[PDB]
Design brief:
Keywords (chain B): Disulfide bond, Pharmaceutical, Protease inhibitor, Secreted, Serine protease inhibitor, Signal
Helix content of chain A: under 10%
Number of strands of chain A: 13
Strand order of the largest sheet of chain B: 1-2
Distance between the termini of chain B: 6 Å
Subcellular location (chain B): Secreted
Largest sheet of chain B: 2 strands, antiparallel
Strand content of chain A: 25-35%
Number of domains of chain A: 2
Oligomer: heterodimer
Structural class of chain B: alpha+beta
Protein name (chain B): Pancreatic trypsin inhibitor
GO molecular function (chain B): calcium ion binding; molecular function inhibitor activity; potassium channel inhibitor activity; protease binding; serine-type endopeptidase inhibitor activity; sulfate binding; zymogen binding
CATH superfamily of chain B: Pancreatic trypsin inhibitor Kunitz domain
Order of helices and strands of chain A: EEEEEEEEEHEEEEH
Shape of chain A: globular
Function (chain B): Inhibits trypsin, kallikrein, chymotrypsin, and plasmin.
Number of strands of chain B: 2
Radius of gyration of chain B: 10 Å
CATH superfamily of the largest domain in chain A: Trypsin-like serine proteases
Number of domains of chain B: 1
CATH architecture of chain B: Irregular
């Protein structure tokens, strides 16, 4: 997250880190046994770390659970990033509490102009690398579909939504994929892609979670 | 393999190797997770061989 602020300790209790040796992607806890993230964060072995604030220090609040099943959306396209969503079933249910909590799935699609909270442990710089120890947060608006299309002509599908500021300065970056974009208490986006980090007229584009609520619920039931 | 390392548009942090031409070796860089170019390898030995 470039141009954001340190999140207050465990103000984001649904945020998880996906770890395979080091942190490579975020995700969101949607119920005590399932995590939603981006399909491009797929790895065959993933450990989910819940209740994290400082990713590099054992604080004693964390729960570390291995992924038992990882299910990518059946229509994920590796090149256009259409349908970039993945579900992870935890080996055992987590212990829900102060620091580890669920985020609600959306009621409807949020309209352009809604403010959203994005969080992650990704790179903090637009040029150069500086990975934070502590979770970063950013407040940014869902942009209108037309501006999204004008920034990335031909690459935006109806399953994508742009968030950010077209004059740049703030945005998610490498290490933030799979993380939550929560707008009014509901998970509306999943961090996916953008050109550069926080560059003028290249906003962030997220997977539009409101198009997948029934696929999510039906997959958790069959599994 | 003379081409610069390409992080790509995706926002994951995946440590990969590229051959740094003007240095003569394979070094690590952060790959974003999609649209990989060819100077991008999962091991140092893979990288050294192919160069």
């Amino acid at each position: 997250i470039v141009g954001g602020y340190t999140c207050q300790e465990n103000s984001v209790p649904y945020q998880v880190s996906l770890n395979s040796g080091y942190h490579f992607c975020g995700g969101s806890l949607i119920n005590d046994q399932w995590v939603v993230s981006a399909a491009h964060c797929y790895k065959s072995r993933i450990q989910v770390r819940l209740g994290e604030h400082n990713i590099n220090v054992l604080e004693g609040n964390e729960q570390f659970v291995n992924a038992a099943k990882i299910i990518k959306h059946p229509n994920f396209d590796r090149k256009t990033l259409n349908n970039d969503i993945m579900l992870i079933k935890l080996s055992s249910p987590v212990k829900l509490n102060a620091r580890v909590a669920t985020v609600a799935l959306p009621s409807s699609c949020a309209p352009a102009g809604t403010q959203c909270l994005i969080s992650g442990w990704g790179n903090t710089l637009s040029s150069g690398v500086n990975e934070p120890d502590l979770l970063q947060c950013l407040d940014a608006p869902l942009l209108p579909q037309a501006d999204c299309e004008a920034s990335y002509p031909g690459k935006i599908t109806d399953n994508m939504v742009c968030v950010g500021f077209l004059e740049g300065g703030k945005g998610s970056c490498q290490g933030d994929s799979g993380g939550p974009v929560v707008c009014n208490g509901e998970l509306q986006g999943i961090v996916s892609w953008g050109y550069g980090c926080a560059l003028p007229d290249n906003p962030d584009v997220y997977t539009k979670v409101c198009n997948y609520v029934d696929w999510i619920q039906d997959t958790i039931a069959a599994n | 393999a003379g081409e610069p390392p390409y992080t790509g548009p995706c926002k994951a942090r995946i440590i990969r190797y590229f051959y740094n031409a003007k240095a003569g070796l394979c070094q690590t860089f952060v790959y974003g997770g999609c649209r990989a170019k060819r100077n991008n390898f999962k091991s140092a030995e893979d990288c050294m061989r192919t160069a």
